[PDB]
Amino acid sequence: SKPQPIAAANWKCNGSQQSLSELIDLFNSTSINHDVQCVVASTFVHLAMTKERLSHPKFVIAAQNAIAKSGAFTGEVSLPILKDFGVNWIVLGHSERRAYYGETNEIVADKVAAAVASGFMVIACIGETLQERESGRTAVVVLTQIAAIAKKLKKADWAKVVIAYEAVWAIGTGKVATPQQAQEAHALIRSWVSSKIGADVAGELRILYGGSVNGKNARTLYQQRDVNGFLVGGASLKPEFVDIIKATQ
Amino acid sequence: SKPQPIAAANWKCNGSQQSLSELIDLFNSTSINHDVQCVVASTFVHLAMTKERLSHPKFVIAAQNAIAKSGAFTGEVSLPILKDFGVNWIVLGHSERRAYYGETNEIVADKVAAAVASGFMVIACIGETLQERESGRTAVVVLTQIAAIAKKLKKADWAKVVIAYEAVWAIGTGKVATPQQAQEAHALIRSWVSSKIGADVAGELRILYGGSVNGKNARTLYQQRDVNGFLVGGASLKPEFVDIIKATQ
Numbered sequence: 001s002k003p004q005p006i007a008a009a010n011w012k013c014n015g016s017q018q019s020l021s022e023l024i025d026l027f028n029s030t031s032i033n034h035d036v037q038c039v040v041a042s043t044f045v046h047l048a049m050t051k052e053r054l055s056h057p058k059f060v061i062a063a064q065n066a067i068a069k070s071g072a073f074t075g076e077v078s079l080p081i082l083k084d085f086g087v088n089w090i091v092l093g094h095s096e097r098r099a100y101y102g103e104t105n106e107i108v109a110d111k112v113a114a115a116v117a118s119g120f121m122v123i124a125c126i127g128e129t130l131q132e133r134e135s136g137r138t139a140v141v142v143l144t145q146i147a148a149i150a151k152k153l154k155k156a157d158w159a160k161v162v163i164a165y166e167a168v169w170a171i172g173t174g175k176v177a178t179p180q181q182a183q184e185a186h187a188l189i190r191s192w193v194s195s196k197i198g199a200d201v202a203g204e205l206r207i208l209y210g211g212s213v214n215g216k217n218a219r220t221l222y223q224q225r226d227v228n229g230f231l232v233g234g235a236s237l238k239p240e241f242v243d244i245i246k247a248t249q
Numbered sequence: 250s251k252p253q254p255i256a257a258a259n260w261k262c263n264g265s266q267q268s269l270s271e272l273i274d275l276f277n278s279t280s281i282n283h284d285v286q287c288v289v290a291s292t293f294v295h296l297a298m299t300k301e302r303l304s305h306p307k308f309v310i311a312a313q314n315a316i317a318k319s320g321a322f323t324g325e326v327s328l329p330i331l332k333d334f335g336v337n338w339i340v341l342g343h344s345e346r347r348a349y350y351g352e353t354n355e356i357v358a359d360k361v362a363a364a365v366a367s368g369f370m371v372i373a374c375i376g377e378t379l380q381e382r383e384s385g386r387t388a389v390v391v392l393t394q395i396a397a398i399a400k401k402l403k404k405a406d407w408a409k410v411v412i413a414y415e416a417v418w419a420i421g422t423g424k425v426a427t428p429q430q431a432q433e434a435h436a437l438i439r440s441w442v443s444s445k446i447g448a449d450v451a452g453e454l455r456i457l458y459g460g461s462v463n464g465k466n467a468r469t470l471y472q473q474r475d476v477n478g479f480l481v482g483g484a485s486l487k488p489e490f491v492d493i494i495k496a497t498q
Contacts, residue, residue, distance in 0.1 A: 073261060081262065
């Protein structure tokens with residue numbers, strides 16, 4: 001048995017007010033009989049409606065991104081802004097931001113540490129591409145990313161840290177990730193944390209699977225020793241997200 | 250005559266729920282006797298409240314950025330999302346996003362083209378830096394930037410285009426933008442438009458001044474022939490933004 005699992009919805013850059021309203025209420029309707037933190041990471045635009053319309057005691061809201069401080073940064077949203085808005089959870093370092101929007105390992109780490117310092121619960125994303133997996137660089141890449149983050153934190157910080165292992169290599173590539181492959185990656189990350197931060201931090205840490213997660217595959221993913229729940233992409237916009245949460249029992 | 254002026258508030262990455270609420274109600278309180286579009290560009294997070302709480306007939310809400318389409322773009326907000334949210338104005342290509350967030354001339358142009366195609370009113374920002382100006386490259390840079398935008402648009406598109414001339418070189422630098430320098434930038438711009446797009450377009454086009462504007466300089470800036478209002482930064486978070494609106498009379 002395990003730390004409290006997390007079922008996190010990464011809606012990404014998606015939703016309409018009507019589509020999202022209905023999903024929120026489906027989420028509200030769910031009876032969750034176990035301890036699980038559910039999280040909905042909507043676009044910035046949708047944070048208001050979600051905050052107001054989502055009333056479920058097991059759900060919190062998150063941002064999908066931020067910058068560290070307010071000021072002369074047109075188009076961007078900052079941590080104190082989110083904080084003032086009552087958002088206390090945030091996803092940082094998503095593969096898409098690292099790929100498209102200039103988030104290097106250091107930029108992500110700095111954002112994580114800034115969010116940790118401001119009181120956020122952080123879902124810090126790491127993980128490797130297909131090309132990196134196929135060139136034998138899974139451990140090099142993933143451990144590099146997490147080392148970059150961890151050197152910006154101190155022990156106390158890890159209470160507020162969640163690590164999402166995005167198996168990007170396993171999303172839309174032909175390669176469907178087995179529970180074993182998932183487990184093998186999560187084990188790698190947990191051993192690293194044990195060895196580098198300590199076995200007590202490693203035992204408390206939630207490591208989320210953020211490859212392709214759906215209603216069908218979640219339970220058998222979740223059952224693996226070192227999988228503590230999920231950061232869900234496209235399925236999180238659908239009813240089966242409920243079955244993903246249920247799969248964390 | 251001058252076309253309808255625009256008084257636009259760029260809040261940049263600033264505001265709390267309480268601070269912004271008070272500011273919005275001041276804006277609601279204003280009595281505006283002349284024809285002017287006031288626009289409030291808040292952070293994505295504050296769009297819901299601004300929309301809900303701003304009730305003034307001369308005001309519209311705007312975003313400070315978007316990407317073209319919805320999808321797997323964690324952290325970003327798209328044009329369709331904004332549209333579904335009732336947001337029909339947008340500021341694109343702000344100096345800060347060009348400087349910090351990878352927006353080349355092409356990227357801005359592409360965003361502007363997509364927003365226009367989507368039915369948005371677009372405040373497209375151009376302008377040179379202090380050292381561009383002091384190397385004698387004002388006209389090179391500014392006309393380069395508008396050309397990159399214009400080549401992706403067609404004639405009928407321009408009814409939805411506003412140009413904001415950001416006098417970046419004049420904000421916090423010690424260099425003083427006289428009304429004469431504002432006017433000659435604006436004239437360069439409208440000349441270009443007249444000569445490259447058409448004198449009819451150029452006569453209808455709002456070219457907003459977006460160097461340092463405050464309640465004290467605004468009237469004198471407005472009275473220049475080629476200035477059609479303002480994209481105000483710091484002063485837009487303050488009461489004197491009302492005086493800036495009044496100055497477009």
